[PDB]
Design an enzyme around this catalytic site. Structure first.
Site, PDB file in Angstrom:
ATOM      1  N   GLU B  59     -22.431  10.248  -8.460  1.00  0.00           N
ATOM      2  CA  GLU B  59     -21.244  10.087  -9.292  1.00  0.00           C
ATOM      3  C   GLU B  59     -20.362   8.926  -8.840  1.00  0.00           C
ATOM      4  OE1 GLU B  59     -17.734  11.135  -9.094  1.00  0.00           O
ATOM      5  OE2 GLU B  59     -17.780  11.292  -6.907  1.00  0.00           O
ATOM      6  N   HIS B  60     -20.625   8.337  -7.674  1.00  0.00           N
ATOM      7  CA  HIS B  60     -20.140   6.979  -7.447  1.00  0.00           C
ATOM      8  C   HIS B  60     -20.967   5.940  -8.196  1.00  0.00           C
ATOM      9  CE1 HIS B  60     -16.716   6.791  -4.719  1.00  0.00           C
ATOM     10  NE2 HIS B  60     -17.143   7.942  -4.238  1.00  0.00           N
ATOM     11  N   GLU B 136     -13.941   6.739   2.098  1.00  0.00           N
ATOM     12  CA  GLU B 136     -13.334   7.895   1.443  1.00  0.00           C
ATOM     13  C   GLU B 136     -13.514   9.172   2.248  1.00  0.00           C
ATOM     14  OE1 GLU B 136     -14.612   8.443  -2.539  1.00  0.00           O
ATOM     15  OE2 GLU B 136     -13.559   6.692  -3.329  1.00  0.00           O
TER      16      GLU B 136
END
Lengths: 101, 439, 414
Positions: B59-60, B136
């Site tokens: 999903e990145h 992140e």
């Protein structure tokens, strides 16, 4: 009929004895959480006069001497000041009770 | 108008199935806007130990270059038609959704199928996103609440795949090459486990036709074991922080029980408080009333989380390091008060809070379409809210206290602490405070 | 759908509007022109103490009955405030609109403000200000609106450091009596009928400052948090006009919040200009704030402590070269599609629609439908955009910066 009741009330107030020590009607109130709330909700100048009258009363019971006759707080010149605050406190306490019932 | 009026008059959530097991679902209303997404029942629960973190990785990479629209053509066309785009992935579910305009339905469906089934993996992109996902990781290390919930899952489901965090461990981030990611993409996303959900001012015929057009050639053609709720205590003592974060959960029932509705009523009673609220001393929760009266905690939220035939029945409070035990005692007192002698009036208050929170939540477009996705994956059908009204009307005080005596009372908690938690009790004090001898 | 929205100005002065839809959640918004811009230099923070005073005792209902009744029907009573407007929004399910209507009337037009509750609310004010300013954005924007006006727009949303505890119920009675009038009120209903609101506001209300000049200046804050925030802001336009619409088109030309999550923002031009210039973790966005008499346009940057100056210089040269006549008309159409999407999707949900309809009815005194708003967004021309950017260039600037300010230009070195 009317003033006979007034005679009873004024005689009882003379024979109570706290008027002889510089007190008013609401400087000898019993304390529960309600009256502690009502004392907490007071203004400032009346609270300062309250602690000063209490401190004079404790002094004059410390040497057990009553004030001279001219400084006794007579009937119907005292402030019945604590009555609306304490009335609203008791109304809110009964409001909590009869709402949670 | 009344509840029969306002609950009969509701849109209908027309569903259908394309001949690939593709579950497609629409809901119509009068506002001129649309929310179209692909919900996917494949997160980090399906990942093994060596492939932790590939879902967050996908999903990145899902917006960083397809085959037909390369690296920036996708975002250029999206922000040239003027739409919002968003994605997330929990430990089970993963959603790609576009908040878009009504006249942009076919271009949104085309771009969304191109995002789903034709993700390219260029090695420049895998280098960039390896560095970005490591940064992140280091960013999400600071937010204490997610650290606490990751502690709570990793100590409540010790050993099972459900203890895997979403992003995965960092050495399992910096070692995944391209072939494992291609194997992941070519395994999980095929036939029954994807729902094309579409809420808002669109047409169900057009949405079915566009699914029939673009999702052709997807051609989809073996998991979900039960999990162990261990129950334990993890503490991460760090005395250089200003606040203590403590979560505690027992095992919740899952998705498929009316006991879920009962515990939703119970956690609607206990619920939430924060330090900035208006009106402190007179709140309806007795927990909140005591916690304002004596200034114990900064905040709490007492809640439910359901996974596929398991769940946490949880409570999470952020409090000062001097009053952890007092807040703990009052919390378990409120649990057992609802377990043993909860009267009718507070159950009626819980039912009103449940109705108001549910109806005020399922409003707008995005929570509606989120509900369509999670309601077709977990249940198999989106429940209309009249049936939730029926199952609320099947709840009195008796069912609530019996189900709370079935779940809260006398279990082994998972306690997860982070921060200055010296005054947090040892685990047997939580146990001796859990049950009652009437204390 | 046989019920479109209804609109009626009752000639005592107030505006009742409604939208009877068949949605099960009923909202009652009450919008009042009593924000921060209607204060003077003597009762600062009376807006904030008034904002945290929803749950005090009213003439007719004590605070315990208010809190327990609202949470017994489970409606949300929220108070939202912008520098123009306060807004009492109470929502629930449609079977309990009447009791919450009564409590709304109580909190508005039966004010008491007894003193001990005011002291407890002072402590609440300090904790709320701390929770609010743990974000840097709020402190940057408050120094921004303090450094760009000499006058009534320079009043904070929050009570300052020293006035906590020294605001009294005398000023509360004064501010309530002379800023809650029957002409400054918009009663908006979502899910209720118009005649019920007409009965309520016809029976139970019956009650009956100065323009802001531009100042120009800068405010800096040495905070050392390793993220220089910098807002560079010039006076643009008042609300309501196609001048303000042209500045909205200009901010969507320059760059807004990220439409794509974890994206690159390749449609936004300022980000591409600074990314060609600077190779850092940075962020640049536009900033259009609008008010009744005036309004601000500028940009808002977050950068590392080393090279904020290169960021602000690159963004300033980009805005100058768009102002001197260098842009594409398909970029204008992409900006207009972004603005149409932003306006049509800010009014999907309940609270955004309530806020839009209520402010739109209250400010201009009349409602405008959404479709003609889309038409007027379409009707804005390109020379208007170039002239708005030229007005940004030819106007005096105003800057608010916070953080490690070792490498930040002041005014001339922009």
């Amino acid at each position: 009929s009317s003033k006979w009741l007034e005679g009873i009330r004024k005689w009882y107030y003379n024979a109570a004895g706290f008027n002889k020590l510089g007190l008013m009607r609401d400087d000898t109130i019993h304390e529960n959480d309600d009256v502690k709330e009502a004392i907490r909700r007071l203004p400032e100048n009346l609270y300062n006069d309250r602690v000063f009258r209490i401190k004079r009363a404790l002094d004059l019971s410390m040497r057990q001497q009553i004030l001279p006759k001219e400084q006794w707080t007579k009937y119907e010149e005292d402030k019945f000041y604590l009555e609306p605050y304490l009335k609203e406190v008791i109304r809110e306490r009964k409001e909590r009770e009869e709402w949670t019932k | 108008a009344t509840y029969a009026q306002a609950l009969q008059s509701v849109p209908e959530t027309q569903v259908s199935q394309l001949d690939n097991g593709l579950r497609v679902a629409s809901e119509q209303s009068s506002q001129p806007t649309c929310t179209v997404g692909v919900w996917i029942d494949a997160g980090s629960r399906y990942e093994t130990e060596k492939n932790n973190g590939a879902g967050y990785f996908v999903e990145h990479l899902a917006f960083k270059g397809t085959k037909n629209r390369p690296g920036n053509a996708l975002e250029k066309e999206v922000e040239s038609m003027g739409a919002h785009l968003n994605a997330y992935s929990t430990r089970e579910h993963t959603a790609y959704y576009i908040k878009a305009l009504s006249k942009d339905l076919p271009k949104a469906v085309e771009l969304l199928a191109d995002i789903v089934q034709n993700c390219s993996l260029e090695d420049s992109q895998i280098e960039k996103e390896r560095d970005v996902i490591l940064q992140e990781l280091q960013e999400n290390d600071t937010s204490m609440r997610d650290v606490v919930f990751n502690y709570l899952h990793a100590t409540a489901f010790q050993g099972t795949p459900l203890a895997q965090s979403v992003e995965g461990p960092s050495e399992n981030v910096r070692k995944l090459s391209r072939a494992d990611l291609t194997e992941y993409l070519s395994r999980h996303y095929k036939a029954p486990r994807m729902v094309l959900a579409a809420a808002g001012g669109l047409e169900h015929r057009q949405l079915l036709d566009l699914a029939q057009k673009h999702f052709s050639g997807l051609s989809g053609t073996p998991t979900l074991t039960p999990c162990r709720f261990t129950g334990s205590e993890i503490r991460h003592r760090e005395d250089g922080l200003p606040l203590a974060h403590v979560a505690i959960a027992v095992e919740g029932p899952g998705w498929a029980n009316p006991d879920n509705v009962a515990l939703q009523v119970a956690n609607a009673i206990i619920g939430h408080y924060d330090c900035t609220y208006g009106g402190g001393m007179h709140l309806s929760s007795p927990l909140a009333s005591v916690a304002v009266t004596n200034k114990l905690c900064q905040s709490f939220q007492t809640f439910n989380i359901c996974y596929a035939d398991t769940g946490l029945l949880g409570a999470h409070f952020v409090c000062d390091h001097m009053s952890i035990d007092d807040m703990m005692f009052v919390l378990q007192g409120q649990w057992m008060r609802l377990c043993t002698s909860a009267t009718e009036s507070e159950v009626v208050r819980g039912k009103n809070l449940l109705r108001n929170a549910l109806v005020s939540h399922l409003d707008g477009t995005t929570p509606v379409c989120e509900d369509i996705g999670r309601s077709l994956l977990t249940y198999g059908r989106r429940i209309p809210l009249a049936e939730w009204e029926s199952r609320i009307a099947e709840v009195d005080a008796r069912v609530v206290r019996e189900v709370c005596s079935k779940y809260f009372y006398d279990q082994c908690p998972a306690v997860a602490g982070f921060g200055p938690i010296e005054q947090l009790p040892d685990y047997n004090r939580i146990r001796s405070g859990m049950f009652w001898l009437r204390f | 759908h046989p019920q479109d929205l209804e609109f009626t100005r009752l000639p005592n002065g107030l505006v009742i509007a409604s939208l009877e839809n068949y949605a099960p959640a009923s909202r009652i918004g009450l919008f009042i022109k009593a924000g921060s811009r209607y204060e003077n230099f003597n009762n600062l923070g009376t807006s904030h103490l008034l904002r945290l005073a929803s749950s005090l005792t009213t003439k007719g209902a004590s605070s315990f009955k208010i809190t327990r009744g609202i949470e017994a029907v489970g409606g949300k009573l929220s108070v939202t405030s912008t520098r123009e407007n306060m807004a009492y929004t109470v929502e629930c399910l449609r079977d309990d609109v009447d009791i919450l209507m009564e409590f709304l009337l109580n909190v508005t037009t039966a004010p008491e403000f007894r003193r001990w509750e005011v002291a407890a609310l002072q402590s609440q004010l300090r904790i709320d200000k701390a929770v609010a300013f743990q974000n840097p954005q709020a402190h940057v924007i408050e120094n921004l609106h303090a450094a760009a006006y000499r006058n009534a727009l320079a009043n904070s949303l929050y009570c300052p450091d020293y006035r906590i505890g020294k605001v009294t119920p005398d000023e509360l009675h004064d501010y309530v009596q002379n800023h809650f009038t029957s002409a400054r009120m918009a009663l908006i209903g979502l899910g209720v009928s118009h005649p019920v609101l007409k009965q309520v506001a016809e029976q139970f209300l019956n009650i009956r400052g100065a323009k802001a000049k531009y100042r120009g200046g800068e405010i800096r804050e040495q905070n050392g948090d390793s993220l220089v925030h910098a807002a560079l802001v010039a006076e643009s336009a008042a609300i309501g006009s196609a001048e303000a619409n042209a500045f909205s088109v200009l901010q969507h030309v320059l760059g807004a919040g990220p439409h794509v999550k974890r994206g690159s923002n390749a449609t936004s031009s300022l980000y591409q200009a600074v990314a060609k210039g600077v190779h850092q973790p940075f962020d640049v966005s536009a900033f259009n704030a609008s008010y009744s008499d005036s309004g601000l346009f500028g940009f808002y940057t977050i950068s590392q402590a080393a090279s904020a100056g290169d960021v602000i210089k690159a963004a300033y040269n980009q805005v100058k070269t768009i102002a001197q006549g260098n842009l594409s008309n398909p970029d204008v159409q992409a900006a207009k599609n972004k603005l149409k999407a932003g306006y049509l999707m800010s009014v999907e949900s309940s609270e955004g629609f309530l806020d839009e309809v209520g402010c739109q009815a209250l400010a201009a005194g009349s409602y405008t439908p959404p479709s003609t708003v889309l038409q007027q967004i379409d009707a804005v021309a390109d020379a208007d955009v170039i002239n708005a950017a030229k007005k940004f260039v030819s106007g005096r600037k105003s800057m608010a910066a916070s953080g490690n300010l070792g490498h930040t230009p002041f005014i001339d070195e922009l």
